C-alpha cells in the first residue's frame, strides 16, 4: 500500500551469465553465518562473505551449472555445498576448514531444480531434482554413494520444489505446474494435481514452509505462496479437506521470483517477490504491501539471512543486474508494516487511559500531547 526507499547496500562485482535458479545463501564453513553462493554457466562458483566486493573463494567444477544449494545432504551433521551441472554431473565441496571438489557422481540429464530435505519422515535428508522434461527424481546418500529412488512423470512443466507440513503433520513435496497449478508427489519409501483463469501456458512459481510463530522454525508450516509471470500472487493454507484461500493480489508486472524473509522481526515471515524491471513486493499475512522500486532490470533475485557487517546475521535482499553487479540491501528491517501515528498507537495500551483518567475531545488530546512532547517544563 506504501512504497519505501532503502539506502544501505553493498555492490559486488560479478561478470557472467546464470539461470534464475543458480543463486542461494547459507553457511558453508559452519560458523552460524550465512554466505552468498552464486554459480554461472561458465563452470565456476563464487562465495561472498562479510561485506567485501571480491569473492571469498572460487570453486571450479566441470560442466554448466543449473542449480546450486547448501544443506545437510550426507546426514553426517555438517552443511555441504551441492552443485549440479546441466549435462549429468553432481559435486560436493566440503568448504568447512581452485578449490577442487571431493566427490563426483553422474546423474540423469536435463537438470532444472534442486532441493535438499527429508520428505518421508525417516530422519535422513534426501536430494530431489526436477527436470526440464516434466520428470522429478529423488535420491538418497546410502552409506558412500548416492543411490536413486522413486521417479515421477508429469505433464506440465516444473519450476519449483518445496517441502511443507502435510495435513496430518508429515512432510510433503510440492512441484509447480503451469496455469497457477501445483502437484503433490506421493511419498517415496502417484502424483496428485491441484488447480487454483488465465493462459494455460503461464509460468508459475511456488514457495512453502512459511513460519507463523516465534521459535517454531523447528517443525511447523501450513502456508505456501504462489506467483505467476502474468503478475498474480496468492497465499494458500493447507488444512486437511481443502486449501483455504488467505489473500490474492493482482499486480501489473512480470513476476519471476518468490521467496520469504523476516523483516519486521516478530517471528512471522513475509512473502517477497521480484519482477524483471526491479519492482519488488513485500507482503505480510494480512495483505499489507510494501513496494521497493530499484530502477534497474533484474536477472536473478534472492532473499534471506546474511552476515553483512560486524559479523552478525541480518535480513538481506539480493539483486543481480545486467550491469555486472549484485546489490545486497541489508538495513531492510522495518519497525512495522502499516502506516500509523502516535494517537492510534497509544490508544491500544490501557495505561494511557488510566493516566488520562487520573489526570482528569481529540483536539484537547492533541494539545496535551504537543505540550508534553515539546514543552516539558
Amino acid at each position: 500500500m506504501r512504497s519505501v526507499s532503502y539506502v544501505q547496500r553493498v555492490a559486488l562485482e560479478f561478470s557472467g551469465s546464470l539461470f534464475p535458479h543458480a543463486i542461494c545463501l547459507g553457511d558453508v564453513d559452519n560458523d552460524t553465518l550465512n554466505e552468498l553462493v552464486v554459480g554461472d554457466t561458465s563452470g565456476k562458483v563464487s562465495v561472498y562473505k562479510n561485506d567485501d566486493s571480491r569473492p571469498w573463494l572460487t570453486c571450479s567444477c566441470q560442466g554448466m551449472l543449473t542449480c546450486v544449494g547448501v544443506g545437510d545432504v550426507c546426514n553426517k551433521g555438517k552443511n555441504l555445498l551441492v552443485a549440479v551441472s546441466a549435462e549429468g554431473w553432481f559435486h560436493l565441496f566440503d568448504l568447512t576448514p581452485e578449490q577442487r571438489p571431493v566427490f563426483k557422481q553422474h546423474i540423469p540429464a536435463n537438470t532444472k531444480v534442486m532441493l535438499i530435505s527429508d520428505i518421508d519422515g525417516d530422519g535422513c535428508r534426501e536430494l530431489v531434482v526436477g527436470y526440464t522434461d516434466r520428470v522429478v527424481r529423488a535420491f538418497r546418500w546410502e552409506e558412500g554413494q548416492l543411490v536413486s529412488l522413486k521417479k515421477w512423470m508429469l505433464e506440465g512443466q516444473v519450476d519449483s520444489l518445496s517441502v511443507t507440513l502435510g495435513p496430518l503433520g508429515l512432510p510433503e513435496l510440492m512441484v509447480s505446474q503451469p496455469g497457477c497449478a501445483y502437484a503433490i508427489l506421493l511419498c517415496t519409501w502417484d502424483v496428485v494435481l491441484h488447480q487454483t483463469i488465465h493462459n494455460k501456458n503461464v509460468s508459475t512459481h511456488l514457495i512453502g514452509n512459511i513460519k507463523q510463530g516465534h521459535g517454531t522454525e523447528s517443525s511447523g508450516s501450513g502456508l505456501f505462496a504462489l506467483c505467476t509471470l502474468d503478475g498474480t500472487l496468492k497465499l494458500m493454507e493447507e488444512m486437511e479437506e481443502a486449501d483455504k484461500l488467505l489473500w490474492s493480489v493482482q499486480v501489473d508486472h512480470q513476476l519471476f521470483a518468490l521467496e520469504k524473509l523476516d523483516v519486521t522481526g516478530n517471528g512471522h515471515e513475509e512473502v517477497v517477490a521480484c519482477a524483471w524491471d526491479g519492482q519488488t513486493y513485500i507482503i505480510d499475512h494480512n495483505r499489507t504491501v510494501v513496494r521497493f522500486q530499484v530502477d534497474e532490470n533484474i536477472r536473478a533475485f534472492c532473499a534471506g539471512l546474511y552476515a553483512c557487517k560486524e559479523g552478525r546475521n541480518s535480513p538481506c535482499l539480493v539483486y543481480v543486474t545486467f550491469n555486472q553487479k549484485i546489490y545486497v540491501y541489508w538495513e531492510v528491517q522495518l519497525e512495522r508494516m502499516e502506516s500509523t501515528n502516535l494517537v492510534k498507537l497509544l490508544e491500544t495500551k490501557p495505561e494511557y487511559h488510566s493516566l488520562l483518567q487520573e489526570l482528569g475531545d481529540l483536539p484537547v488530546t492533541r494539545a496535551l500531547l504537543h505540550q508534553t512532547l515539546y514543552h516539558p517544563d
Binding site: V4, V7, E335, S339, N341, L342, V343, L355, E358, T372
Partner: protein, 399 residues
Amino acid sequence: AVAAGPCPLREDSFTRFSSQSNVYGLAGGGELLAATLKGKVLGFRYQDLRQKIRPVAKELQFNYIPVDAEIVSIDTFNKSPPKRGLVVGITFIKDSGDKGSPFLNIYCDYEPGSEYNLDSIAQSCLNLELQFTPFQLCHAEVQVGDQLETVFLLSGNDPAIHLYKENEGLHQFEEQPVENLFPELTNLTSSVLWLDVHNFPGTSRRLSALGCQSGYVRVAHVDQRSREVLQMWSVLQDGPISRVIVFSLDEYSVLVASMLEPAVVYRDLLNRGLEDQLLLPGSDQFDSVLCSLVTDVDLDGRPEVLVATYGQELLCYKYRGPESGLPEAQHGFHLLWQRSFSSPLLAMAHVDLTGDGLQELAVVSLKGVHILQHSLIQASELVLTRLRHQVEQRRRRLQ
C-alpha cells in the same frame, strides 16, 4: 564528527517524481505543496482509515501556464488575521524564443464560501510580466497603520526585491515601492538567494537577514512603527549563501549555511553583533549544504540544527549549553546523529502532516518526497513516562 546516538527517524512513505524539482519547490498549505520544474505540482496529505493512515499524493492543475513553460519558484501563505484567505504564487518562464519571458502568477479565490478551497484557487490567475529573472518568492507580515498586512517579496535578476501589495479596492496585487515598508532592502550588489525576516512577538520591532551569491551576509535591526533602522551588521563570506535563519537559543542568534564553508552560527546579535561565531564541527565533509532547518527534533524543548547536504546527508546538531559546566566545551554544538538518503536532498519542512502533535519531517530530494516520522515505539514511551512523572507530581509535590 562522530554521531552520539542513533537516528530516531523511520521512513513512512515515498512518492516518486517524474522530473526533478528545486529548492523553492516546497511550500505549505495541514497540507504540503511540491512543484516539479516541468509544470507538475503535487499536494501531499494523509487520510485516516479507522485504525491506520494512508499517504495521499494528488496532482494539481493550474491554468495559465503553457505546456512549454518551466516553473522556477513557488510560495504561499494565509491572509492576515483580519481577512480570511489563502494566497499562492508561482514564478515560471515562458520558453518564447532564445530569450525566455519571465512571468508571475498569483492565485486567490475572492469569492466567499470557498476562499480557502484549493480547487477554486486553481483558476483565479493574475498574469504579470517581470522584466527580470525571478529567484525566490517569500512573504512577510508588516504592521501598517493599526493592522497587519501580508506582502510578497521577490528577488530579481536586477539586484532588488520587488514588493507586491494587494489593493483593498479593485482587489488585485500590484507592485509597490520597497522603501515604503522595507527600508533595509535597498542598494544591493548581488542577487539575494535567501532572505529571512523575523518579527518580535508583542513588539513593533524586527530583525532582517539576507545572503547573496558573493558571500555577503547582512543583518539589520528595524523598528516597525517608526520605520527606522536601528543598526547594521555585515560580513563577507565565500560561496553562495544557500540559507540564513534567525532563531533564539533577548539573546538572538543566526545560522548561515554557505555552500562551500561549514555552517556557522552567530551569537548575541543585539549585544555583540556578528562577532561571536560557533562553527559546527565537520559539517562540510558531505558535499555541499543545500537546505537547512531549525526546530525541536529531540522533544526536549531546546532547538536543534538540521543540515541537508548534496552528498545525501541529514546531519542533526545539538547545543551543549552552559548548564553542563564544561568551559572547555561549554556553549558548543555537537553532532547528535546522521542519516543517509538515496538522492541528493533539496528541501526540508517540519509539519504535523498526520494530526497527532508530532512534527513529521518532509524531505524533498531529486527523486521525490520522503516522509520521516519519529520512531513510534521510542515516542510512545516518552509520553507515558512524562505522564507518570506528572500524575504523581500532581499531589506528592504540590498537593
